[PDB]
Design a protein around this ligand. Structure first.
Ligand SMILES: Nc1nc(-c2ccccc2)nc2[nH]nc(Nc3ccc(C(F)(F)F)cc3)c12
Lengths: 40, 252, 273, 172, 57, 252, 40
C-alpha cells in the first residue's frame, strides 16, 4: 500500500527482467552463429 | 558465396570496399535514426542536409611504427573543418549525429601486430598536470589532427594508454563498442554508432560525443627486415544528421 | 526452471563452437557443453540479487558537515565560525559511492536522503543538551544564508526539515535533472572558450543544502556533526563502462597522480602459480 | 545609468540612423533586464525553466512617422551580435510601423537541453536579443524628435517551471 | 498528450498573427508556429508543480 | 477584414510583416517548386537544405536621395556570402532556386517619389567600354554590394538607367515581373520568382539567373525641408533550394 | 483514508485543473482572433 501520492515516495518496487546481453556481446550487423566460422 | 569477409558500404556519394574485414559493429545493437516527435523538445523545424553531409570523409593518415603509443580523435570535432558538414556545425545551434567509423591498416602476410579500435562516449580526459587542472579547450578540440599519444605535452591530457586517458585500464575498455585489427587476418574495422546523449539534441561545438581510440596492443613487427612503417587511415561519415536553429557563424 | 547445463555426449562434427574470432568484437554465448561432456542440471538462480537496482539502491554516506552551537563572535563571518554550514550537492565527495556511479555513463534515479546528527562536547561542560538541527535546500538562484539566524532560514518556499540530535530525517527527492539522465562524465565545456572548466562539474547546478543549530547558545560550545546518507531508487542506467583503477584526486575531475602505481599485482614468472 | 524614473521603460529611436543597434541584451530570466518583469518575478521562485518566451514591442511616436525595425534572437554559443549582418542570421522578424502598433516575436525553444536554469549559468545560456534599424526613423519634414517604443514580455502557452526555491528579492 | 508545438511550414498569407495592438490590453495566445517553421513535439508537462496549492501550501 | 494591404510572410525561421503593401507577385503565374523526375537529368540524389537555407537574408541598405540613379543586384550572387546558403553555393556543383524578393522603402505622407522594382532573367550587361569589350567577372559578381548606377567606372557595365544596362528602354522593362513603390501608397514590393532556365539545374557560381533592378522613376521629394534621404532595404530568400554533386570548396 | 471528521483536518487533497488564462489575457468584450487586425 502506498501512503503518499507523490510517486518519488514509492518504495523501490519493481520486477526482475530477462537479461539481454546481446546488446553488449553480439552487436554485429551480420548474425554470427555458434559453430559457424567467425571469419567466413 | 557472399562471404562475410567482403563488404561494400555506400553512403551519400562515396563508397568503401573491403575484401578482408570482420563483421561490422552496430554499437549497443541499435542502428542510427532520426529524432522522434516523442523525444523531441526543440520547437523548430529541423534541417536534414541528407547526402550533402552524410558521406565519407577521410582524415589524414598517421604512421604506425614500433614505439607508437596510439591516437585519439574526437567527434564531431574531427570533422569540423570538412565539407558542408564542417560548415553546418557552426551555423546550427544544436544537432545530432550518428556515425560510421572505419579504420584501415594494410599489411602483408609477413607482418604481425594488432590495433584496438574503441569508441568511447563522454571520454572525459585527465590533465597532464593532474591536481585541479582542467584540460583547455584548445587541447580537446584539435580537429583532423588527433591527439597523438606519442607526443609530449604538459598542458594536454595524459598520454599513457595503459590507463587510457582517464584512470581506467585499457584491459576493460573492451566494454565499449570495439573491434580489433589483426594484421594477419583483417585490415579494417568498422563501427556504426547511434546518437548517444542525455538530451535530444546538443551543441556540436562545446561538447564532444564520441572519442575514437586507436591503440596498438601488439607492436608492428615483421618476419624479417627493418622496423616497418604502416599508415593508418581513418574514414568517418555522419549517418542521420539532423540540425536545428540558425545563428551567425559561431566563432571559436 | 532455467537449466544451467544439458546432457551432452562426445561429438565428432564439422561444427566447431570452440573456434571463433574476437576480432569481430563479439563474444559468442558458448557453454561448457560446447567443450566437454555435460550432465543436465538446474541453475536454481534468478539473478535478482545482481539487478542494477540492488547494486546502486543501498544507502551510502555522501557528506559530513560540522556545525557548532556557540555564542556568536562579532569579529568573524558566521559561516567561518561554523554557526551554519553549506554543502554543495554532489555524490562525488566520497569514493565508495562515486565508484559505483562511475560504472555507468548516464544514470537516472530518484533519491532518498537520511540525515543523522550526533553531538559532542569536548570541553568543561556542566550538562548535555539535545539540539534541534535544521536542514534546508537552497537551489540555484535561492538566497544563501549569511548569518546563523537571518531571514533566509524562514524557509518560506525552500523545502526543509527539523530534527533532533540523536534522531534522523528522512525524505525523498524526485529526479531533478535537466536532461533525461544525470551525466557521470562530460567531454566538454560550459561554452566555446579557450579558458573554462572542463568536465562534469559544469553540469552540477544541483544547489546546496544548509545546516543549522536552531537553538541559542547555551554557555558551552557544542559540536554537531551531521552525516548525510543517500540511496537511489527506481534506478535506470545506460552505457556501462570500465571502473576506475587509479585513485581519485578531486571532485568531478578524472585526474590522477603524475606517477601512478600500476594497479596490477606482479609476480616473478608468467608460469608462477 | 542616469535613467531614473519611468525612462527605463522607454526605448529611443532616432532619425537618419540606419543599420545601427537600437537595443540589445543577454536573455536571462534571472539577473538580466527581465529580472523585474512578471516572468522574472515568477521565475525567481523556480529553479528550472523551459519553453518559449514572447516579446512584444509597441510604437508610441507620431502617427505620421514610419520605420522598419529588425528584431532578432541569437541562439546559444554565438557572440554579440555586433553588426546587423550577424543579427540577420538568427531568428528574426522585420517590423513595419503602421496602423497595428504592436509586433510580437515568439522566441522558439532552441536549447539542446530539456530545461535551462533561471539563475544565470553559462551551460544553459539562452543567447541574446537585439534590435536594429532595418531602414531608419522618418518624421515629417523639418522636424527633429526622439520617439520611443515600449517593450513587453510574456510566456508562450508552452512554458514550464519546476522545483520551487526562495527568491533573492527579500533583504530582511 | 498535450502538444507543445505542431509542424508548420513557410507561409505567405494575408493573415498576420505576428502583428497586433497591446493598446487593447489583451495578450493574444500566439505560438512559435506563428513566427517560424516548427516541428511537432510533446510538452510532457502538466503544470501540476505550479499550482497555486504548491506555491502557498 | 483581411485587407489586401496587410501581409505576413513566414519562411524558415524568419518573418516579414507589412501594413502598407501591394498584392505580391508570382512571376509568370507560377509558384516555385522542386525538380520533377521527368525534368531531371542529373543522376545524383539531391540535397534539400530546407529551412536551414530557405529563410530571409537582408542585404545592406542603400540611401535613396535626389540624383540617385538606381541599383542592381544579381542572384544568386548577392547571397554568396550569407549563411549556410552562401557556403552551400561553393560545395555543390549545381543547383536550382526560386526566390522571394522583398524591397522596402519608408516615408511619410509628406513625401513623394516612386521606385520601379523589376526582376530580369538573363540580364546580359553592356560594357562601359563598348566595342568588343566584355564585362569582367569581378564586376558582375559584387556580392551584397550591388551595382550602384550612381558610381562611375570604366571597366564596369554601362550605368545609364534609361537604357537599363543592355540597350532596351526602361519604359518597356515592365514586361518583366515588376512592382512599383509609390511612397504615397505603399512602402514595400514583393516578387516571388520560380526557377527559370534552359536546364534542370545549373552552376550557382559561373552564371546568374535573376537580376534585380531598383530604379527610381520619380525622385524623392518632400512638401518642405531639405533634400530627403530614405534608406532602401532588400530582403531575399531562397524558396525551394535543391542542390547536387559534392566537390571541394570552389575557389573564385 | 481520512482519520478525522473535521474537514480542516483533511490533507491537501485536490486535482489539477485546466488553466484558464483568458481571464487575464483576453478580457475583451469583442473577441479578438489571431491573424485578424487588432485595430479594425
Ligand atoms: N547535477 C548534475 N547535472 C547533470 C546534467 C546536467 C545537465 C545535462 C545533463 C546532465 N549531470 C550530473 N551528473 N552528476 C551530477 N551531479 C549530481 C547529481 C545529482 C545529485 C543528487 F545528489 F542530488 F542526486 C548530486 C549531484 C549532475
Amino acid at each position: 500500500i502506498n501512503y503518499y501520492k507523490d510517486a518519488a515516495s514509492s518504495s523501490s518496487a519493481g520486477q526482475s527482467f530477462s537479461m539481454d546481453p546481446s546488446k553488449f556481446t553480439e552487436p554485429v550487423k551480420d548474425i554470427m552463429l555458434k559453430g559457424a566460422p567467425a571469419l567466413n | 558465396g557472399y562471404s562475410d569477409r567482403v563488404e561494400q558500404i555506400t553512403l551519400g556519394n562515396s563508397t568503401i570496399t573491403t575484401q578482408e574485414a570482420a563483421n561490422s559493429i552496430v554499437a549497443y545493437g541499435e542502428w542510427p535514426s532520426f529524432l522522434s516527435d516523442v523525444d523531441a523538445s526543440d520547437v523548430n523545424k529541423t534541417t536534414k542536409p541528407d547526402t550533402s553531409a552524410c558521406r565519407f570523409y577521410t582524415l589524414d593518415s598517421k604512421m604506425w611504427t614500433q614505439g607508437s603509443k596510439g591516437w585519439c580523435w574526437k567527434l564531431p570535432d574531427a570533422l569540423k573543418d570538412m565539407g558542408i558538414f564542417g560548415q553546418n556545425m557552426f551555423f546550427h545551434s544544436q544537432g545530432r549525429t550518428g556515425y560510421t567509423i572505419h579504420v584501415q591498416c594494410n599489411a602483408t602476410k609477413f607482418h604481425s601486430g594488432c590495433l584496438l579500435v574503441v569508441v568511447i562516449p563522454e571520454h572525459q580526459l585527465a590533465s597532464a598536470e593532474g591536481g585541479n587542472v582542467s584540460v583547455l579547450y584548445d587541447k580537446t578540440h584539435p580537429g583532423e589532427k588527433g591527439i597523438d599519444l606519442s607526443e609530449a605535452d604538459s598542458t594536454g591530457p595524459m598520454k599513457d594508454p595503459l590507463y587510457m586517458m582517464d584512470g581506467t585500464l585499457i584491459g576493460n575498455s573492451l566494454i565499449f563498442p570495439h573491434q580489433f585489427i589483426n594484421l594477419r587476418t583483417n585490415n579494417t574495422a568498422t563501427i556504426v554508432v547511434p546518437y548517444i546523449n542525455s538530451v535530444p539534441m546538443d551543441s556540436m561545438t562545446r561538447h564532444n560525443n564520441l572519442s575514437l581510440m586507436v591503440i596498438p596492443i601488439v607492436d608492428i613487427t615483421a618476419t624479417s627486415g627493418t622496423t616497418p612503417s604502416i599508415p593508418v587511415t581513418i574514414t568517418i561519415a555522419p549517418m542521420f544528421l539532423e540540425l536545428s536553429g540558425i545563428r551567425s557563424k559561431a566563432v571559436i | 526452471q532455467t537449466l544451467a547445463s544439458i546432457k551432452s555426449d562426445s561429438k565428432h562434427t564439422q561444427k566447431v563452437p570452440s573456434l571463433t574470432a574476437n576480432e569481430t568484437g563479439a563474444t559468442l554465448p558458448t557453454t561448457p557443453s560446447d567443450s566437454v561432456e555435460t550432465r543436465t542440471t538446474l541453475m536454481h538462480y534468478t539473478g535478482s540479487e545482481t539487478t542494477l537496482e540492488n547494486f546502486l539502491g543501498r544507502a551510502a554516506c555522501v557528506h559530513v558537515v560540522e556545525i557548532v552551537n556557540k555564542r556568536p563572535t562579532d569579529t568573524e563571518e558566521h559561516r567561518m565560525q561554523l554557526l551554519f554550514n553549506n554543502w554543495k550537492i554532489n555524490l562525488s565527495s566520497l569514493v565508495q559511492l562515486r565508484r559505483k556511479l562511475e560504472m555507468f555513463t548516464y544514470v537516472r534515479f530518484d533519491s532518498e536522503y537520511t540525515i543523522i546528527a550526533t553531538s559532542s562536547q569536548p570541553n568543561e561542560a556542566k550538562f548535555s543538551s539535545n539540539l534541534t538541527i535544521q536542514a534546508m535546500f537552497i537551489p540555484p538562484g535561492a538566497p544563501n544564508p549569511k548569518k546563523w539566524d537571518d531571514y533566509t532560514w524562514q524557509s518560506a518556499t525552500n523545502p526543509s526539515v527539523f530534527f533532533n540530535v540523536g534522531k534522523s530525517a528522512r525524505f525523498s527527492v524526485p529526479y531533478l535533472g535537466i536532461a533525461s539522465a544525470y551525466n557521470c562524465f562530460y567531454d566538454g565545456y560550459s561554452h566555446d572558450n579557450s579558458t573554462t572548466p572542463y568536465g562534469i562539474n559544469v553540469l552540477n547546478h544541483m544547489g546546496s543544502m544548509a545546516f543549522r543549530v536552531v537553538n541559542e547558545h547555551d554557555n558551552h560550545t557544542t559540536h554537531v556533526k551531521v552525516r548525510v546518507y543517500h540511496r537511489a531508487k527506481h534506478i535506470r542506467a545506460w552505457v556501462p563502462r570500465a571502473p576506475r583503477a587509479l585513485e581519485y584526486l578531486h571532485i568531478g575531475r578524472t585526474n590522477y597522480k603524475q606517477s601512478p602505481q600500476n594497479p596490477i599485482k606482479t609476480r616473478k614468472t608468467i608460469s608462477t602459480y | 545609468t542616469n535613467t531614473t524614473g519611468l525612462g527605463m521603460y522607454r526605448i529611443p529611436l532616432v532619425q537618419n540612423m540606419q543599420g545601427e543597434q537600437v537595443f540589445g541584451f543577454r536573455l536571462y530570466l534571472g539577473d538580466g533586464v527581465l529580472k523585474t518583469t512578471l516572468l522574472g518575478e515568477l521565475c525567481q521562485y523556480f529553479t528550472h525553466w523551459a519553453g518559449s518566451l514572447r516579446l512584444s514591442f509597441m510604437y508610441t511616436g507620431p502617427a505620421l512617422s514610419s520605420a522598419k525595425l529588425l528584431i532578432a534572437y541569437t541562439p546559444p554559443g554565438a557572440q554579440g551580435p555586433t553588426k546587423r549582418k550577424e543579427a540577420m542570421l538568427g531568428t528574426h522578424v522585420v517590423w513595419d510601423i503602421g496602423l497595428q502598433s504592436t509586433v510580437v516575436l515568439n522566441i522558439p525553444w532552441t536549447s539542446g537541453v530539456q530545461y535551462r536554469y533561471t539563475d544565470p549559468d553559462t551551460y544553459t545560456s539562452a543567447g541574446f536579443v537585439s534590435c536594429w534599424y532595418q531602414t531608419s526613423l522618418v518624421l515629417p519634414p523639418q522636424t527633429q524628435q526622439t520617439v520611443y517604443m515600449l517593450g513587453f514580455i510574456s510566456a508562450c502557452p508552452d512554458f514550464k517551471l519546476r522545483l520551487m526555491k526562495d527568491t533573492q528579492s527579500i533583504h530582511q
